[PDB]
């Protein structure tokens with residue numbers, strides 16, 4: 001129960017507090033809550049939590065005109081494998097989502113459902129129980145020895161998905177997207193980052209396929225672009241977005257130590273820009289910064305300093321969300337925000353600060369997060385972080 | 400006979416005046432003379448015109464420790480097609496180049512031969528007269544209708560070179576490189592920019608081949624990388640460099656309006672870094688700035704402001720030469736030179752100022768260039784531009 005140890009600076013006079021249109025939505029400011037997995041969903045139906053989640057999103061959407069991106073949400077059972085993450089395919093899931101979306105909308109804020117497909121990050125023993133596959137780009141590229149052992153113990157070995165299985169995932173992204181928007185979501189974000197399934201195709205470290213979905217930049221990007229084009233066909237580009245982590249190592253991805261990694265992302269993003277010029281553009285592209293190559297490590301650890309995301313601005317001409325260690329670095333937030341149509345995301349600091357937008361605007365101290373309750377099935381560390389005024393009444397101080 | 404109309408600033412205390420090792424050469428400063436076609440060579444035989452050219456290069460190398468890159472120089476007759484541009488394949492050419500290199504070395508300066516292969520930019524009647532092909536990546540993608548008629552009038556229609564003929568060009572780059580080094584050059588620069596033959600393979604606008612030399616990023620880069628690897632094998636990576644122009648439109652190239660551009664160069668530059676890390680690092684990569692999309696246009700005209708070359712610094716960890724409209728913008732030169740191992744090239748202003756280095760160091764007025772004599776077969780506008788003291792004696796004033 002203390003404040004992050006830094007000197008806060010007000011952002012209210014920077015471009016962070018300038019309004020911007022993102023697809024259909026008229027944002028009042030550029031402080032975004034990125035996708036944050038919390039593990040409060042109810043098992044066995046992957047149901048958004050009925051007692052606690054509406055309050056959690058209600059709190060963090062309190063500042064009018066905020067973009068909220070939901071926790072990663074599975075578009076089908078085969079996409080999942082964590083029981084306490086929500087899904088968005090079933091009627092009982094959708095019923096609960098609608099209440100969440102309503103709370104955010106009642107705040108005059110916006111909600112975007114992140115569509116998350118795990119691939120090899122999934123727990124294969126959990127999948128096995130449900131008669132589901134342990135999927136990736138290849139049979140044989142395990143993300144590590146422990147994961148390989150877990151898969152073999154479960155008798156659910158890693159499976160390089162087929163072209164038909166690829167089409168099936170495509171159908172499930174589309175299905176979940178239509179369902180999300182029908183239930184009242186403003187848009188959906190395709191998760192193509194952090195070493196999950198689409199990223200597993202993007203990165204040569206995890207994809208040495210010799211069909212059309214591996215062996216070249218264009219082929220590695222194919223699955224991701226089919227997903228984008230199918231979701232766009234179904235709900236429109238204005239209601240679609242995507243997330244990449246060019247410099248990420250989490251999930252046993254390449255990161256910037258492979259000098260060919262920038263070209264991969266330059267290509268896929270250039271393809272999205274091509275599509276934008278030909279018609280309606282994707283609402284935004286979300287990039288994880290090299291500031292955070294692995295979100296399990298504390299701020300400023302494994303900050304890749306030898307490469308940046310600046311290349312995007314020479315390719316994509318629409319809004320760009322940037323996320324990674326900004327809470328502690330208002331100076332860098334302010335600098336990045338001077339670039340055209342740039343939104344700044346705050347992850348761990350939004351977990352800890354329900355009224356983050358206001359604190360950022362006024363340069364107030366930020367609550368420190370409690371890592372212990374990032375992923376516990378608890379109200380504690382979810383909806384009981386105080387507002388600023390409450391932190392002062394409790395005598396909070398720098399850790 | 401006037402100065403450029405701008406406010407000069409001294410650069411002597413910036414990074415531009417710090418020494419740096421480039422290949423085998425200890426540069427005293429980072430002001431570079433890039434390649435500049437002047438068309439003073441003797442026809443027939445493409446013979447360097449030592450009677451005029453020795454003095455031109457002596458003048459511009461006067462400041463000890465300067466890197467000079469020659470005018471584009473043909474590595475073989477079939478590479479050519481401009482009768483007053485020099486070659487470096489023949490005994491009689493080499494005998495003249497030896498004298499020019501000597502003069503530069505007497506100044507304790509350095510000289511790098513730009514190896515220039517024209518492809519479709521060539522004049523097809525001039526090649527036809529010599530019994531030579533008019534070459535490109537394809538038989539049918541002409542740089543324009545004027546140029547197409549010209550080729551058909553000369554019964555030398557464009558020709559997409561075959562793998563055998565590509566191998567022949569590679570052989571010629573190797574041959575001309577060994578020859579150039581043997582005559583005393585410090586290095587060679589492979590010209591892969593400004594809409595010439597290699598750039599014609601890199602850009603989809605001039606290359607819709609469906610063999611291994613086009614149809615993808617890796618394919619389109621293949622000829623350029625083969626040239627690099629051959630030359631490096633023949634003369635060493637420390638005597639090898641390359642030039643690109645990602646944002647160039649000169650030569651009917653795509654430039655930045657094609658959003659796939661950046662990926663193409665990130666891919667080629669990442670491949671060059673992979674080579675470096677395996678122990679064969681090119682001496683430097685030379686990039687034309689988006690500041691000058693077409694060097695036939697006045698400074699500040701057709702400045703592509705929607706894209707930058709900053710992506711290089713996330714990929715290549717070797718020296719970078721950057722060129723384009725720097726004379727008139729010492730603030731931008733200074734800023735760009737703060738990036739690691741960055742050299743600043745000056746083209747039109749080096750044409751006009753024999754003692755440009757000194758004038759940059761001290762913040763002195765610069766002579767204005769006269770385009771009229773860029774390509775005339777004369778000493779006027781070549782060797783008669785005045786030193787600073789001489790311009791003061793003649794009462795020069797701003798344009």
Ligand SMILES: Cc1cc2nc3c(=O)[nH]c(=O)nc-3n(C[C@H](O)[C@H](O)[C@H](O)COP(=O)(O)O)c2cc1C
Pocket residue numbers: 034035036037038070071072114191193194243288292295296323324325326327345346347348349374375
């Ligand atoms: C507890 C936790 C859960 C996260 N869950 C998600 C997720 O569901 N989807 C996703 O794309 N990124 C997720 N991330 C990554 C964040 O959105 C973000 O990119 C990262 O935490 C760096 O930003 P920050 O330094 O502001 O926290 C998560 C990070 C943490 C710490």
Ligand SMILES: Cc1cc2nc3c(=O)[nH]c(=O)nc-3n(C[C@H](O)[C@H](O)[C@H](O)COP(=O)(O)O)c2cc1C
Pocket residue numbers: 433434435436437469470471513590592593642687691694695698722723724725726744745746747748773
């Ligand atoms: C008259 C003239 C001749 C040129 N010749 C060459 C050449 O042989 N090779 C080359 O790579 N670029 C050539 N360039 C391009 C220059 O090297 C340079 O990229 C361009 O002029 C922009 O830099 P600047 O604004 O300092 O002139 C030429 C430019 C001009 C104006």
Ligand SMILES: O=Cc1ccc(O)cc1
Pocket residue numbers: 037072193194295
């Ligand atoms: O649970 C942590 C987490 C991190 C990144 C993601 O993309 C998803 C989940």
Ligand SMILES: O=Cc1ccc(O)cc1
Pocket residue numbers: 436471592593694
């Ligand atoms: O003569 C102009 C010229 C421009 C760019 C080049 O690369 C070569 C020549």
